[model samples]
Target: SNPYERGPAPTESSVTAVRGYFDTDTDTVSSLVSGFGGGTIYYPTDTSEGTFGGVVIAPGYTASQSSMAWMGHRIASQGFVVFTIDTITRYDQPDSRGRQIEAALDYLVEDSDVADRVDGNRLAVMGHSMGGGGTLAAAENRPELRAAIPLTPWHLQKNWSDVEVPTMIIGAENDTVASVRTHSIPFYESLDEDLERAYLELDGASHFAPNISNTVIAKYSISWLKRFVDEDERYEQFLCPPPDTGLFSDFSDYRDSCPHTT
Candidate 1:
């Protein structure tokens, strides 16, 4: 894969521009059990259209769910049913990792405020760093998730190439922790399915930039979710045109060269 293979690269005019005011109230929902600590949820603002596809995001080690606020907010605006929960940093803490997501999904699917709106079948799980490993562990129990995205994931528990769901492993060019050799590229190579299990390496980014308050990361992630969930044309523009003139120009010197697609 070419390091600059996202095609002609995104220019100022080619990228999709987003504009809106987001909710800053980082409040916890009432349905959460004792395990899911004070994480936040951003519901779709446009309730008139009913619920969209859902995503359960798990944050990295020592990282709060609030760190992914930009991503959550962007997805919510794009007509997604979203939820993000914190992962308590303790060894073998299976309850906090898996139970928290299950509980949040329980709350979302059963809540009177948004139950009828959610599309129960299109659920997905996304996480970063240590949380990515947890996302895999959590998915073992919740087989209903349609997809999984583990961004610069921590290679702790095990490799999830066997995960039948369409999985996307997004990595960074300069990622130190979960290098392509160790995690991202290898995971993509090991998947044994007719379904798409791809790896996207973002040039000029690091392990932290992909999840640490970076607006560009948020844009890329939202665009991916839009393609998979929202079914919007703007997001399809990201990968169309067959290997140039897509979603590469969003950041300066930024590149996306995933061999499986182009």
Candidate 2:
């Protein structure tokens, strides 16, 4: 009886597949659009499933929206409104990227052709590197956001106890640009212990991993959105116990506020 649940029941292969149960389509937003630089909106075509949660993804510093474009369909096909956006400029800082992300969400819910298909109240933010940093900034600014995921995030400001949004940060073990030791780890550790949070360290990944189509990133990201955005407990199995590690695992380390109270 979950009102928010969409698509078919989930299985390991279901979440790992390049696409999800919902057939999806895309609508382009011109760069001339208002708020943030315009980007594409990928959404599920099934209105029978009802409005889907909205997710806005930002690209890292100096990277165009194309860097994160692969995720648009990857996530939307799973039954969410996914917007992968471009910043006003290539060099926009994290704070600027944060603002752009907020603006992008505003557009997604308020003006996109599929606006009627998106549940504005159910929203999330995600990014890579500086964009990851922006993800945190947006969450702090918009506590109503249901979830957040920062991939190899980079930011000069690390304290995030004030941000209550449920967040899962993905870090690359070999990332030198924004090493987990200085960026991702501290960002995760800084959150209030009671806050629903998690850290995923990709075993052999790099900061650029978010730029590519990655199954580990897609699976967990999808799980977090479902568990938090849709408020569906079925996906909780993928998060609790913190997943596995070691030579065979995709991640080298995982941390979380398991036994989640929410």
Candidate 3:
């Protein structure tokens, strides 16, 4: 039996749909909490699956939790506790947001009412723009994290060779703000050659693509989180060999170290 596997077997429609197998619920977290500015917790109510993995997501600089809130139910229904959070301040930098992401996960795992429902050992981090860079920052520091997804991330430091977390960096083809050529591509290339990693460039997408609920973003993110955090190879079909790209495709350019060793 696949001890870590949750929900049902995957299908093309399953991952791309607006929701997944589990019926989920949300408990609003307060902004008054310590560590990170609190947001909301979206989680599956089903206890039969044992515990779901925890995922902490932060918004970019000058942004609030609302920017990343759309992901809560989308990810939660797929069988994970999604904590969409805020920074101590809107202007916090990548490393600071990185710490906030960790702090938020700490709060979810130890203090939140849903603590009993989350498997902290399988935690992951994700974000957009500066928050995306924060995902990298978190991955660099928290080796215990199972996976990382930085959506069109922007950071001054492009080298992420020190990270061991299985990372999937989503870059927008037309991301003038972060520019795939500079930020996302280089960041993906910086990973250790053998590290389980991927670079997904969205066709005709922009820096704010992650800010909205794009089907492509949700599809791969679910696959990445499932493949790593949940250890569900059923989702691997979407990752290995990577997904098709080019004219009229959801992706612009996609690359990965397939036949993942993880």
Candidate 4:
């Protein structure tokens, strides 16, 4: 059975419009759900929409949660619970960062105020740089997660062949920190063919691309998340349609096994 196949579209109406401060002037409020292992939570102020899928994001090496704030706000505004976390130690590696993400998810599930608003079964992990690598680790460690989005992940190892979760690997062509050739490409290549996956490389983009509010990233990420996390087929069109190079001026390359067209 398709675990993601919910009865109807959850937030179809809300996601199409820009509601959050990051993307819109609309008045959608997101507040911090505090006191959870030094992590920062960004959840929709209006729970009238009912339970939402949750996502836990970790920052890069020595990077703070504030750096990834744009994504938190963007994702949350689209009617999901997003947690941007700080590593207990700023110098933590991918494995440690991965564990931190899991801990945050566990906390969210247990929090009475937040738990009821989040669909625990539909969860994802995402991160930038080492935190990106940690996103891979988290998904690998927790098979229950719906998906993962690793942006320019930095890691010494190229083998994440064991990861079976649906994944979207974002790479920056000009990123000197974590070269797409050594990091993102190989990571995407190493994944087992059985899982749904995609790899996107942005032309002239730096490793910092994911940190800011990039429209291309936002479009694809939100679409991917909704399709897999919410199990809504409505988002499939956004993923399956071949890219128009003229429209995506920033994209250098794109490849995916979407709509399961096998």
Report the C-alpha displacement of residue 132, candidate 2, in angstroms.
0.4
lDDT against the true structure, per candidate, is: 0.58, 0.91, 0.91, 0.77
* Number of backbone clashes in candidate 1: 4
Q: Write model 2 residue lDDT over 14-67, tens digit each, in one string.
A: 999998898889999898877688888999988996899999999987898799
Global CA lDDT computed for model 1? 0.58
Off by over 4 Å in 3: none
Model 4 RMSD in angstroms? 4.7
What local lDDT does model 1 show for residue 34?
51
Residue 81 error, candidate 1, Å: 2.2
TM-scores for all candidates: the values are 0.74, 0.98, 0.98, 0.85
Q: Which ten-residue region of model 4 has the weakest summed lDDT?
A: 21-30
Worst 10 residues of 1 by lDDT: 1-10
- Order of the predicted models by lDDT, top scorer first: 2, 3, 4, 1
Model 1 stretches astray by more than 4 angstroms: 1-27, 30-35, 88-99, 140-143, 213-216, 230-234, 241-262
Q: Give a tens-digit lDDT track for model 1, residues 29-124.
A: 542345565456666555454456778787776776766666666666545667877654534243356566666677666652565666776677
**Each model's RMSD to truth, in Å?**
7.1, 0.9, 0.9, 4.7
lDDT, candidate 2, at 21: 91
Q: Please say which candidate is ahead in lDDT: 1 or 3.
A: 3
Pitting candidate 2 against candidate 4, the one with the higher lDDT is: 2
TM-score of candidate 4 to 2 decimals: 0.85
